[PDB]
């Protein structure tokens, strides 16, 4: 699928996230996520907290409590679609997803 990542600083990236990848994984390989070593592509991170555009946040799978605190590690007023770069998976239909890292600290 077509996925696009936006850094909370205002940078954007667009990768190809097929079936079995996560918004992070693709970007990850692309270095988009040169963060720390928590999720390692398994949704165990406190820094990949990101906001998916409401359009791909409703199609994506339902994130579990593991995507709530991990993702809420940084007080970013967790939205309804917020999620750590490594928790949503991309299907061959949900393509065109736009991600964004929360600058909620501003
Ligand atoms: Ga992560």
Coordinates of C-alpha atoms and ligand atoms in Angstrom, one line a residue:
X1 CA 0.0 0.0 0.0
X2 CA 1.1 3.6 -0.3
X3 CA 2.1 5.1 3.1
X4 CA 3.4 8.6 3.8
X5 CA 5.2 9.6 7.0
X6 CA 5.3 13.1 8.4
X7 CA 7.8 13.9 11.1
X8 CA 6.6 16.1 14.0
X9 CA 9.2 18.6 12.8
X10 CA 7.4 19.0 9.4
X11 CA 9.2 16.4 7.2
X12 CA 7.3 14.0 5.0
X13 CA 8.2 10.6 3.5
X14 CA 6.2 8.2 1.3
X15 CA 7.0 4.4 1.1
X16 CA 5.3 1.3 -0.2
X17 CA 3.8 -0.6 2.8
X18 CA 2.4 -3.9 1.4
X19 CA 0.5 -6.6 3.3
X20 CA 2.5 -7.6 6.5
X21 CA 4.3 -4.2 7.0
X22 CA 3.6 -1.4 9.5
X23 CA 3.8 2.3 8.9
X24 CA 7.1 2.1 10.8
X25 CA 8.7 -1.0 9.2
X26 CA 8.7 0.5 5.7
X27 CA 9.8 3.9 7.0
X28 CA 12.1 2.1 9.4
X29 CA 14.0 0.5 6.6
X30 CA 14.0 3.9 5.0
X31 CA 15.5 5.1 8.3
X32 CA 12.4 7.2 8.8
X33 CA 12.5 5.8 12.3
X34 CA 16.1 6.2 13.5
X35 CA 14.6 6.3 17.0
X36 CA 15.7 4.1 20.0
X37 CA 15.5 0.3 20.4
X38 CA 12.1 -0.5 22.0
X39 CA 9.5 -1.7 19.5
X40 CA 12.2 -3.0 17.0
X41 CA 9.2 -3.4 14.7
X42 CA 7.0 -5.1 17.3
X43 CA 5.1 -2.2 18.9
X44 CA 7.1 -1.9 22.0
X45 CA 8.1 1.8 21.7
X46 CA 7.5 5.0 23.6
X47 CA 8.9 7.3 21.0
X48 CA 7.2 6.2 17.7
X49 CA 4.0 7.8 19.0
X50 CA 2.5 9.0 15.8
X51 CA -0.9 10.2 14.4
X52 CA -2.3 8.5 11.3
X53 CA -4.7 10.6 9.1
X54 CA -8.3 9.9 10.3
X55 CA -8.8 8.2 6.9
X56 CA -6.3 5.3 7.4
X57 CA -6.9 5.2 11.2
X58 CA -10.5 3.9 10.8
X59 CA -9.5 1.2 8.3
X60 CA -6.4 0.0 10.1
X61 CA -6.8 -2.8 12.7
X62 CA -7.8 -2.0 16.2
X63 CA -4.7 -1.2 18.4
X64 CA -4.7 -2.9 21.8
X65 CA -3.9 -1.5 25.3
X66 CA -0.2 -2.1 24.3
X67 CA -0.7 0.7 21.8
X68 CA -2.2 3.0 24.5
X69 CA 0.5 3.5 27.2
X70 CA 3.4 2.7 25.0
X71 CA 2.1 5.2 22.6
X72 CA 1.1 7.6 25.4
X73 CA 4.6 7.4 26.8
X74 CA 5.0 11.0 25.7
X75 CA 2.1 13.1 27.0
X76 CA 0.6 13.8 23.6
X77 CA -3.1 13.9 24.5
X78 CA -3.5 10.5 22.8
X79 CA -6.0 11.0 20.0
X80 CA -8.5 8.5 18.8
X81 CA -6.2 7.3 16.0
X82 CA -2.8 8.0 17.7
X83 CA -0.5 5.0 17.6
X84 CA 3.2 4.0 17.9
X85 CA 4.9 3.8 14.4
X86 CA 5.0 0.0 15.1
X87 CA 1.4 -1.1 15.9
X88 CA -0.7 -0.7 12.7
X89 CA -0.3 -3.1 9.8
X90 CA -0.9 -2.2 6.2
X91 CA -3.3 -4.2 4.0
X92 CA -3.4 -4.2 0.2
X93 CA -6.6 -2.1 0.4
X94 CA -5.8 0.6 3.0
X95 CA -3.3 2.4 0.7
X96 CA -2.6 6.1 0.7
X97 CA -2.1 6.4 4.4
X98 CA -0.7 9.6 5.7
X99 CA 1.2 9.5 9.1
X100 CA 2.3 12.3 11.3
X101 CA 4.3 12.6 14.5
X102 CA 2.5 14.7 17.2
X103 CA 4.0 18.1 17.9
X104 CA 1.4 18.3 20.7
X105 CA 4.3 19.7 22.9
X106 CA 3.8 23.0 21.0
Ligands
LIG1 GA1 8.3 1.9 17.3

